[PDB]
């Protein structure tokens with residue numbers, strides 16, 4: 001799993017066209033104030049251990065940032081070893097569930113399988129942009 | 137080299153604190169309308185051939201998008217095989233020079249060695265977000 005942690009002042013997205021025939025989540029849009037935006041690329045070796053490490057790390061980083069909202073943002077673009085779409089969707093659902101056991105704020109999992117538009121104002125501080133890899 | 141191609145409606149950034157002792161570019165800020173924003177991670181194996189492939193590809197993609205501004209945005213976060221900072225800065229300068237031989241619009245190379253804040257409104261169309269790897 002490859003993640004990009006963007007500490008934002010604000011974030012929004014809208015699904016636009018479907019990127020898979022039959023996206024497994026319905027279309028939507030949402031907008032947020034301050035939030036940790038986690039662009040999340042699920043990779044071929046990713047199982048439940050990987051999901052648990054990622055969830056602990058996101059919770060731990062969110063705490064150090066003192067953020068109370070996490071956006072789990074499915075992203076196809078951070079790796080060239082992608083998990084297949086059905087397995088990736090499953091891992092993202094597990095990550096959301098795992099994060100809620102460790103982190104007490106708002107956890108928003110954005111829909112999987114769509115092209116999206118988005119805007120972000122990303123903060124400028126030293127820990128505002130970090131990347132992470134998890135595996136098992 | 138790992139790149140992320142973000143076709144934006146608008147883009148802006150400001151350098152904030154230095155991320156290296158002695159950033160090799162001076163601090164600054166800039167804001168743009170529609171632009172191809174290229175987040176660019178220079179990797180250990182990257183030489184002049186790599187820079188030339190990347191420049192051709194960026195020009196080719198910019199043309200297919202019909203964009204007339206490219207932002208070369210140094211980014212430490214797309215790989216776990218980074219080139220050292222001096223070599224990375226050199227490759228980014230070469231990429232800017234190479235791109236200008238192939239692409240006729242505005243080429244903006246953002247300063248290297250700083251933490252930055254930024255905002256982007258990224259477009260929603262199917263080719264609005266792509267990643268690329270180049271090597272030699």
Ligand SMILES: Nc1ncnc2c1ncn2[C@@H]1O[C@H](CO)[C@@H](NC(=O)[C@@H](N)CO)[C@H]1O
Nearest residue numbers: 019041042074075076083088112113115116
């Ligand atoms: N291995 C993977 N890890 C995370 N997400 C993945 C994935 N494989 C497919 N997706 C999702 O399918 C959309 C089309 O690739 C992807 N959509 C996106 O990457 C949008 N932000 C593009 O605008 C994403 O929702």
Ligand SMILES: Nc1ncnc2c1ncn2[C@@H]1O[C@H](CO)[C@@H](NC(=O)[C@@H](N)CO)[C@H]1O
Nearest residue numbers: 155177178210211212219224248249251252
């Ligand atoms: N191998 C590499 N490829 C591209 N850029 C690189 C690099 N090594 C260092 N940098 C630059 O140094 C700043 C601190 O890591 C980096 N700054 C950034 O990544 C900011 N956008 C963070 O807010 C970047 O300018």
Ligand SMILES: [Mg+2]
Nearest residue numbers: 015027028029
């Ligand atoms: Mg809608």
Ligand SMILES: [Mg+2]
Nearest residue numbers: 151163164165
């Ligand atoms: Mg300034």
